[PDB]
C-alpha cells in the first residue's frame, strides 16, 4: 500500500514493541485503536507483512488478530535498527 | 498525470558564489521557506499547503 514512511514506521514500531495487534475489519475508520494512523494502514501494512512470513493472522468475528513471529522479530529489529535483545513481549514478567 | 520536468534548477546562480531565490517562498509557519510558490496568472500558489494559501501577487 502507498502510505507515509512515518506511518509505516509507526505500525512497525508498535508491532515490534507489542508483538501483537488486534485490528477491527473496518476500513475508513481514520483512527486505529492504540495507533495514530488509519485502520486501513494498519490492516494493509500487516497484510504486506503476512505475505513475507514475519506475522500471522486469524480472523475470528470481524477483528484481525495479528501475531508477530520470530522471523518477523529478526526482520523488524533489523528494520527499526534496534540492538539485539531489546523487545517484543517475549516476556518473563515479574508478577506474572 | 505528472508532467515530468527537466530538473529543479530555479535559482539564478551567478559566478562565485552569489545565489538568488527566484520564485519567492511560502510565508506560512508550516513551510519553513524551503518550498516555492507557483506563478500562474497572478496566482501565487503554495504546493506544500496542498490547498490553502493562494496569494495575490
Amino acid at each position: 500500500m502507498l502510505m507515509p514512511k512515518e506511518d509505516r514506521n509507526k505500525i512497525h514500531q508498535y508491532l515490534f514493541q507489542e508483538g501483537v495487534v488486534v485490528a477491527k475489519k473496518d476500513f475508513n475508520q481514520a483512527k486505529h485503536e492504540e495507533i495514530d494512523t488509519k485502520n486501513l494502514y494498519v490492516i494493509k501494512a500487516l497484510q504486506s507483512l503476512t505475505s513475507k512470513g514475519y506475522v500471522k493472522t486469524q480472523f475470528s468475528w470481524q477483528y484481525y488478530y495479528y501475531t508477530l513471529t520470530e522471523e518477523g522479530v529478526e526482520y523488524l529489529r533489523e528494520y527499526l535498527n534496534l540492538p539485539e535483545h531489546i523487545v517484543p513481549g517475549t516476556y518473563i514478567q515479574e508478577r506474572n | 498525470k505528472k508532467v515530468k520536468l527537466a530538473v529543479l534548477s530555479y535559482y539564478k546562480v551567478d559566478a562565485e558564489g552569489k545565489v538568488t531565490k527566484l520564485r519567492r517562498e511560502c510565508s506560512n509557519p508550516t513551510c519553513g521557506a524551503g518550498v516555492f510558490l507557483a506563478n500562474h496568472k497572478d496566482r501565487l500558489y503554495c504546493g506544500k499547503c496542498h490547498s490553502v494559501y493562494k496569494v495575490n501577487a
Partner: protein
C-alpha cells in the same frame, strides 16, 4: 458500569461466545476443548482447557502471553 443486568449478562454471554470462537480458531491444533471465564475483583480469569497444554504454553509461556495480550487488546481490558 451503568449497564442493565439484561444487557450485562447478555454481553457476558457474548464475550464467552466470542472467546470460544477465537480460541477454536487460534488453538485448534492443540486440541482446545473449551474455556471457562471467572470474574473476580481486579481480575477476569480465562481457563483454557486444551489437551496439549505443552503446546498452548510454549517456551516459558510465550504463547499464552500472546493470547493474554490478544484478549486484553481486543476486549480492551487494562493490562
Amino acid at each position: 458500569a451503568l449497564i442493565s443486568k439484561k444487557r450485562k449478562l447478555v454481553a457476558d454471554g457474548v464475550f464467552y461466545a466470542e472467546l470460544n470462537e477465537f480460541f477454536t480458531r487460534e488453538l485448534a491444533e492443540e486440541g482446545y476443548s473449551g474455556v471457562e471465564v471467572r470474574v473476580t475483583p481486579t481480575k477476569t480469569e480465562v481457563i483454557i482447557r486444551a489437551t496439549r497444554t505443552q503446546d498452548v504454553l510454549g517456551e516459558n509461556g510465550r504463547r499464552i502471553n500472546e493470547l493474554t495480550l490478544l484478549v486484553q487488546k481486543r476486549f480492551k481490558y487494562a493490562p
